[PDB]
Amino acid sequence: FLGEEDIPREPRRIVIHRGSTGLGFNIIGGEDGEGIFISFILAGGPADLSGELRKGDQILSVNGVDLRNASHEQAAIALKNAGQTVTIIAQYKPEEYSRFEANSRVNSSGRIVTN
């Protein structure tokens, strides 16, 4: 059903209330421009419970701080020290993301498929 509908590609604002716990996701990128992408969403974590983030999403900013051209560690530092309420502006970029994970590609609906 849903899985055949196109994944929205416009930027989205996601407000996560995580208090003093991890956001519950992994980031890759931050080397030479690339950008910061979500590579994994932890089951049960705040990011998962938000139901608004997914692997392949690029983190454009955290609490107003532009992360488009952030380095890996600084981006991590920004997220970890973002505070209890984290406002992320994210944008689905599967083609860009697919470059990181082995044997991964994008299907007609924009879904990241790994072979």
Binding site: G22, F25, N26, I27, S39, L79
Partner: peptide
């Protein structure tokens, strides 16, 4: 690099 946050 990959970091869990």
């Amino acid at each position: 690099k990959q970091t869990s946050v």
